[PDB]
């Protein structure tokens, strides 16, 4: 087998607001054949609901599970700062047993926030070691949907670009950073290197150069 498809993928809401997650199944399962889970980042997950409509040992009443057949629901009526996590539905009906894809309950009560963008060229130490990596930092922004583009002179670099994914902060804005690994040859044979960013409209740019 059975395939599970939750919906939506993400849910941007505030402390106080209500959050509802659906879980769709490919084949039928009875009421008493389903469980829901929460996972905070960098931790072993936590049981919430079992038997589709039975709370776990000491779960608050704001958490409420329900549904039938192939369409199931999980509602958190009064979201708290602790209700941020990834949420997984999981079916126990037939063999095989399967898990849903996982839905991120994201904390919005924050407006559109443009990122702080800062740039760092290679360390002379690294250049001596026959490698040249550029670091472009983007932090304290919302939402976590973003893009970055590198420039060798006025021309975009394509490969050697690896970026850290939306690493969420304690103030619940995000942070991401891009790495560009090149040779010392290529780093020295171009007059200046740039980093372009587009976040919810505005296209900002920063620059460095071998002096």
């Amino acid at each position: 087998e059975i395939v599970l498809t939750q919906s939506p993928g993400t849910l941007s809401l505030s402390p106080g607001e209500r959050a509802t997650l659906s879980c769709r199944a490919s084949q039928s399962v009875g009421n008493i054949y389903l469980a829901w889970y929460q996972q905070k980042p960098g931790q072993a997950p936590r049981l919430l609901i079992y038997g589709a409509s039975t709370r776990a040992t000491g779960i608050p009443d704001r958490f409420s599970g329900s549904g039938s057949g192939t369409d199931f629901t999980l509602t958190i009526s009064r979201l708290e700062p602790e209700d941020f996590a990834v949420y997984y539905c999981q079916q126990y009906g037939d063999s095989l047993w399967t898990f849903g894809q996982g839905t991120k309950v994201e904390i919005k009560g924050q407006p559109k926030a443009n990122p702080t963008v800062t740039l760092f060229p290679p360390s002379s130490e690294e250049l001596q070691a026959n490698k040249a990596t550029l670091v472009c930092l983007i932090d304290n922004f919302y939402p976590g949907a973003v893009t970055v583009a590198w420039k060798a002179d006025g021309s975009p670099v394509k490969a050697g670009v690896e970026t850290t994914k939306p690493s969420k902060q304690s103030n619940n804005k995000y942070a991401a950073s891009s790495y560009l690994s090149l040779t010392p040859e290529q780093w020295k044979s171009h007059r200046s290197y740039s980093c372009q960013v587009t976040h919810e409209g505005s296209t900002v740019e920063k620059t460095v150069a071998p002096t």
């Binding site: 009875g30 008493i32 009906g93 037939d94 063999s95």
Partner: protein
Amino acid sequence: TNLCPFGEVFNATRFASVYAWNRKRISNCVADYSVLYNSASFSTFKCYGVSPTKLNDLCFTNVYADSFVIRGDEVRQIAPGQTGKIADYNYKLPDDFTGCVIAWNSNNLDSKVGGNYNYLYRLFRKSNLKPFERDISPLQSYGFQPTNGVGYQPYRVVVLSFELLHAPATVCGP
């Protein structure tokens, strides 16, 4: 009182083998039978002597929920005056049975890759059992694979028996 623990029986975390069937007693509790007969999670629900809808009216001294695990096609054996390996050497209902037989497919619960053999039945016996008899002294394993046909897949079954004693009634409906 509370509800009669029908839940505990009708769905226990796996059941016992047919030859050494389970004999669980239910007493001193309010018994809504509608919770049962209204459910469509059964592929078998037959009654004898009394209608299952009328039981909410009626009182009994005790109620016995005999339960077990058998093959597929043999679900119809679980009846009065029947014939076959199960009705002869394992579990036999009387000719004048006053109760209900309920069963369902459990291929998802009681079948394994390469087969689940831990479920057994008595194959050879020199004579046939009396109504509600269990021998425990030769035997044969079922061997449930999920790749089987409907007739060869495992079916958990429960049988209700209503006792009519000249003694205080403790199991009544709403």
